[PDB]
Design a protein around this ligand. Structure first.
Ligand SMILES: *[C@@H]1O[C@H](CO[C@@H]2O[C@@H](C)[C@@H](O)[C@@H](O)[C@@H]2O)[C@@H](O[C@@H]2O[C@H](CO)[C@@H](O)[C@H](O)[C@H]2NC(C)=O)[C@H](O)[C@H]1NC(C)=O
Ligand SMILES: *[C@@H]1O[C@H](CO)[C@@H](O)[C@H](O)[C@H]1NC(C)=O
Ligand SMILES: *[C@@H]1O[C@H](CO)[C@@H](O)[C@H](O)[C@H]1NC(C)=O
Ligand SMILES: *[C@@H]1O[C@H](CO)[C@@H](O)[C@H](O)[C@H]1NC(C)=O
Length: 410
């Protein structure tokens, strides 16, 4: 469509191959990416330039990821910034080498708590809230229900370890005490026995879905369920995770009432976003584009990530026209330190309303919203939301319920 216009090239890094489990995120977010790019092209928002997104398959592999990045630099056009990075290890290797290349990176799916280190990854940004974002939200929930004595059950895996350790920092001046800290790698039954021995009533769990069935099976035999107990665990599990299989009836008896915590895929506010669409109008539109592609909960973040990139380039263009004798953006060979500086500062100024809510960074980290769910009878039900920017907890009244006439005591 754009004949005389120079391209603003972006290096899209993600697993796209069907030969890799995580390639579904890449493929699932592609319709959202195309929707933001079609509108940017139709209305020519980068006039007289155009958005040139180039895609490179990381294949969710460390070696392959690094080769795709280097091949993109060597034989590809002049990329102004990096868009993507899904698998934690692949994103960490690439992000480590950005400053040397004058390349600002924006990820929509890499949730690892590790990438928060702006001493190691100074040129890395992300629209998606990190795994640690659940902690301030959890802290707000505990104070709301006067649960000042908790116990923690963590899986001995980096993903979960990093979240549990960040929790120690979050609870500093807070009137909350972790009367018990338990760990496990293969079997949680021993740690659950210990929590019951220590008389723990409110449990903060950090483990995968396979381990969750084991935890709830142990909880049943140890009587750690019902009216006197409250489990707070990851909300990102698969709809029928428990159906994938103690007996299944006992597993459900121990599951009943548990609270799920995860990031909110899309905002519930009916406000017009930066695109000029509401999060609900974008969702229906996204659903027509996918055409059975399968849904990714990171689609909203990817859509917003493209809008962050376009607004960053719009700001970068304004700055360059203000600085005489050097405004040839299309010419950026990775040498320009000043160009990277301008892009970096322009992304740090991001503050707009996206499909995933208010898009704001705090040292390259997203200030987003956290979703609270509860397992009632046969499915998880949305029981509230946490706003990171405002530090606001809003519990949907007449949804969250307890086994007794009132919430359990700590
Ligand atoms: C990186 O950005 C922060 C935040 O920028 C402010 O908030 C944005 C959402 C947008 O509204 C901008 O126009 C704002 O300036 C900048 O830090 C804040 O600066 C204010 C004013 O001096 C200060 O009172 C706050 O304490 C600052 N907050 C922090 C966390 O430093 C910051 O200067 C930017 N950094 C660079 C290197 O450009
Ligand atoms: C892009 O333009 C076409 C005009 O043919 C229109 O059908 C479509 O809705 C537009 N998409 C966006 C996202 O504005
Ligand atoms: C970028 O432009 C400079 C300035 O002349 C040149 O020395 C360098 O080789 C260029 N890089 C590429 C990849 O062409
Ligand atoms: C829940 O209670 C809070 C605090 O009083 C109130 O602001 C909010 O409107 C309530 N929500 C519903 C659905 O009642």
């Amino acid at each position: 469509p754009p004949p005389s216009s120079p391209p603003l090239s972006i290096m899209g890094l993600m697993p796209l191959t069907k030969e890799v489990a995580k390639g579904s995120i890449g493929r699932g977010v592609l319709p959202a990416v195309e929707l933001a790019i079609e509108q940017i092209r139709n209305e020519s928002l980068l006039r007289p330039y155009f958005l040139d997104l180039r895609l490179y398959d990381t294949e969710c592999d460390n070696a392959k990821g690094l080769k795709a990045f280097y091949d993109a630099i060597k034989y590809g056009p002049n990329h102004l910034m990096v868009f993507g990075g899904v698998c934690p290890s692949v994103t960490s290797i690439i992000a480590e080498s950005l400053q040397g290349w004058n390349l600002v990176q924006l990820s929509f799916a890499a949730t690892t708590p590790v990438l928060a280190d702006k001493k190691k990854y100074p040129y890395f940004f992300r629209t998606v809230p990190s795994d640690n974002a659940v902690n301030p939200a959890i802290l707000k929930l505990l104070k709301h229900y006067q649960w000042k004595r908790v116990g923690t059950l963590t899986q001995d895996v980096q993903r979960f370890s990093e979240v549990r350790n960040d929790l120690t920092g979050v609870l500093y001046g807070e009137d909350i005490e972790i009367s018990d800290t338990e760990s496990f790698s293969n079997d949680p039954c021993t740690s659950v026995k210990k929590l019951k021995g220590n008389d723990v009533r409110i449990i903060l769990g950090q483990f995968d879905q396979n381990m969750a069935a084991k935890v709830f099976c142990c909880a049943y035999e140890e009587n750690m369920y019902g009216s006197k107990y409250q489990w707070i665990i990851p909300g990102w599990y698969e709809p029928s995770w428990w159906e994938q299989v103690c007996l299944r009836k006992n597993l459900l008896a121990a599951m009943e009432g548990y609270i799920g915590v995860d990031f909110e895929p899309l905002s519930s506010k009916q406000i017009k976003t930066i695109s000029g669409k509401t999060p609900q109008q974008y969702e229906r539109e996204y659903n027509n584009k996918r055409s059975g592609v399968g849904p990714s909960k990171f689609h909203g973040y990817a859509y917003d990530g493209i809008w962050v990139i376009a607004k960053t380039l719009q700001r970068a263009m304004e700055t360059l026209h203000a600085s005489s004798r050097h405004q040839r953006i299309q010419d950026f060979n990775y040498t320009d330190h000043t160009l990277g500086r301008i892009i970096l500062n322009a992304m740090n100024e991001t503050n707009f309303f996206g499909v995933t809510g208010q898009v704001v960074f705090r040292n390259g980290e997203r200030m987003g919203t956290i979703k609270f769910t509860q397992f009632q009878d046969s499915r998880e039900v949305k029981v509230g939301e946490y706003n990171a920017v405002a530090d606001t907890l809003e519990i949907i009244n007449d949804t969250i319920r307890f086994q007794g006439s009132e919430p359990p005591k700590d």
